[PDB]
Amino acid sequence: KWDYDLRCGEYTLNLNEKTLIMGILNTPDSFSDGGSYNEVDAAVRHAKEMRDEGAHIIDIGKVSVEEEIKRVVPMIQAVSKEVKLPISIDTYKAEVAKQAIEAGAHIINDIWGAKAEPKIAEVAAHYDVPIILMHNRDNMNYRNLMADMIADLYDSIKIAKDAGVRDENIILDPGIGFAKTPEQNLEAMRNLEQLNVLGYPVLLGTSRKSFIGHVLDLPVEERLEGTGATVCLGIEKGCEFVRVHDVKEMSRMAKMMDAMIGK
Amino acid sequence: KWDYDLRCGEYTLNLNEKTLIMGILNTPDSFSDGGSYNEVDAAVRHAKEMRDEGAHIIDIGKVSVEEEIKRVVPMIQAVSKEVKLPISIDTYKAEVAKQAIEAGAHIINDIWGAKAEPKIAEVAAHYDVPIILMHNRDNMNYRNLMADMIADLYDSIKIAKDAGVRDENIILDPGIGFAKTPEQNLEAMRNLEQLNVLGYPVLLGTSRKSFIGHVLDLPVEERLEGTGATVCLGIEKGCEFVRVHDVKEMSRMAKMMDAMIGK
Numbered sequence: 017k018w019d020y021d022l023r024c025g026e027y028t029l030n031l032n033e034k035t036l037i038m039g040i041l042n043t044p045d046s047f048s049d050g051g052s053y054n055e056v057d058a059a060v061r062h063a064k065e066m067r068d069e070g071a072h073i074i075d076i077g078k079v080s081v082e083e084e085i086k087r088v089v090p091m092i093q094a095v096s097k098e099v100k101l102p103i104s105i106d107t108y109k110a111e112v113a114k115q116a117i118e119a120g121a122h123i124i125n126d127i128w129g130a131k132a133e134p135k136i137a138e139v140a141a142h143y144d145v146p147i148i149l150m151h152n153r154d155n156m157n158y159r160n161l162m163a164d165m166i167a168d169l170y171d172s173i174k175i176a177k178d179a180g181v182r183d184e185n186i187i188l189d190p191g192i193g194f195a196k197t198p199e200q201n202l203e204a205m206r207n208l209e210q211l212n213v214l215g216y217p218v219l220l221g222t223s224r225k226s227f228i229g230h231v232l233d234l235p236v237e238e239r240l241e242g243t244g245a246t247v248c249l250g251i252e253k254g255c256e257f258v259r260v261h262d263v264k265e266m267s268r269m270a271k272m273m274d275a276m277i278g279k
Numbered sequence: 280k281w282d283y284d285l286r287c288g289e290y291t292l293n294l295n296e297k298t299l300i301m302g303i304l305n306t307p308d309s310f311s312d313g314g315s316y317n318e319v320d321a322a323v324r325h326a327k328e329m330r331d332e333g334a335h336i337i338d339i340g341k342v343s344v345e346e347e348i349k350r351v352v353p354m355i356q357a358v359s360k361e362v363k364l365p366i367s368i369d370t371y372k373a374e375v376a377k378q379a380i381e382a383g384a385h386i387i388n389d390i391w392g393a394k395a396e397p398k399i400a401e402v403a404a405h406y407d408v409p410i411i412l413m414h415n416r417d418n419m420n421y422r423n424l425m426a427d428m429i430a431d432l433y434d435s436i437k438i439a440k441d442a443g444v445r446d447e448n449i450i451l452d453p454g455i456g457f458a459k460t461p462e463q464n465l466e467a468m469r470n471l472e473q474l475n476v477l478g479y480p481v482l483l484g485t486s487r488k489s490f491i492g493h494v495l496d497l498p499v500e501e502r503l504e505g506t507g508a509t510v511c512l513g514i515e516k517g518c519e520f521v522r523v524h525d526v527k528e529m530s531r532m533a534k535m536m537d538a539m540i541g542k
């Protein structure tokens with residue numbers, strides 16, 4: 017199905033053998049601008065735990081560019097040293113992405129799909145790292161949700177390829193919970209398999225999101241079963257990664273799905 | 280999609296609004312032949328709890344016919360009185376089914392698909408209750424798993440309709456974990472949607488089953504995430520009921536699936 021592997025510098029991720037689990041890393045120190053022992057040690061311990069629970073990737077990430085870097089760079093430096101898993105930097109700022117990769121991040125994860133700072137795409141091309149382009153927009157005035165999403169996503173692919181990003185370094189994300197009503201988020205989940213025609217790996221990010229709470233009427237800490245459902249549906253519909261808080265659980269559900277769908 | 284409701288005497292179950300949850304009821308007293316306060320009270324308390332957690336049906340059920348009845352009849356009598364949910368009797372014996380329905384059971388649940396005691400179908404026709412015909416057989420020598428299953432299931436439909444069972448009183452079950460290798464159970468899950476062509480509601484029974492343990496390499500008590508996956512896939516593939524131990528959890532996953540697939 018995928019005739020290439022996701023090359024992540026020292027690590028390589030096979031897109032065919034299993035659904036890949038992206039673990040979402042935790043919390044700033046109230047009295048520092050970054051780098052402090054408490055916050056960095058907590059981060060490493062969480063990365064390690066997620067590694068132990070079946071995570072394949074560690075996702076690390078309103079403040080200023082300077083602060084954002086002072087905060088995230090120490091974390092990338094420790095985790096990359098002490099946890100042997102590829103790291104993604106959760107940013108949409110060109111300069112943050114540069115610093116993070118220098119610091120040791122392997123993948124860029126951009127919630128604005130390179131539309132907030134097109135220059136991030138250049139950073140991506142330059143360092144030759146995979147980049148995640150999530151669907152986003154500042155409004156929710158659609159005429160055909162899926163059609164519009166695919167157009168939007170495609171506008172991001174163009175910015176990315178125009179910058180020099182190789183096809184094999186592009187991953188897409190439907191941006192669930194972003195610029196979408198609850199009913200719209202459900203509709204996107206329902207038609208997720210349409211993203212496939214674009215020909216790129218898809219990452220799903222639904223963990224504990226508000227639309228699950230809207231369906232089940234449950235608070236964030238009570239959303240493991242709902243997250244689970246969305247992950248299951250997502251894998252059935254062909255997604256290659258899921259981005260989750262509950263690594264132990266979701267890793268188990270994914271593995272079971274994989275076995276059933278034959279992956 | 281379904282132009283009829285499942286009529287269960289005093290209760291009616293709509294097949295279209297939501298995935299219906301069948302809760303599996305618990306444990307005999309070591310010093311009695313049945314009816315004892317401890318075992319019946321435990322049963323009622325479990326039924327009540329499952330009712331509270333989102334169960335729509337309570338499933339109640341090598342020993343002799345006489346013992347089987349002495350044991351199950353008191354339970355049906357209490358639960359039916361004290362828990363306002365339809366009851367199914369988990370038996371494949373004609374006389375047990377008769378006694379249970381007299382006792383207050385609303386649905387028959389036959390793991391041998393009316394092939395162990397064809398007369399059970401007559402009991403079904405007579406009392407006009409829905410009957411669940413599960414796929415089973417004494418061997419696993421298939422030539423085309425799904426094709427064979429559908430033939431087998433169909434042999435049960437014939438026994439049932441020959442006995443006078445109305446189409447609207449027939450429910451099917453793929454019999455996962457029965458007469459199937461682990462790889463075969465996975466294949467059945469993978470192609471579950473084929474059961475639909477037969478035109479009857481489908482109930483899925485995978486809870487904590489051994490094939491999940493075989494995939495995840497986890498013991499029975501550690502199979503909630505795997506059960507979850509199978510339930511999710513099952514609903515995506517169109518099943519109308521799921522039969523589960525973990526009612527709270529599975530009810531939540533199902534409800535989320537329903538919302539996503541639009542049910």
Ligand SMILES: C[C@H](CC(=O)O)c1n[nH]c2nc(N)[nH]c(=O)c2c1=O
Pocket residue numbers: 040077106125126127148150189191192193219220221222259
């Ligand atoms: C806003 C929220 C915050 C969080 O959950 O960490 C958040 N950040 N980044 C994200 N990045 C990707 N690729 N996909 C996502 O769905 C997503 C998020 O939901």
Ligand SMILES: C[C@H](CC(=O)O)c1n[nH]c2nc(N)[nH]c(=O)c2c1=O
Pocket residue numbers: 303340369388389390411413452454455456482483484485522
């Ligand atoms: C054998 C096992 C025992 C149990 O789990 O209660 C068991 N009994 N009855 C059952 N009845 C139906 N309709 N579907 C099933 O999958 C099933 C079972 O797995």
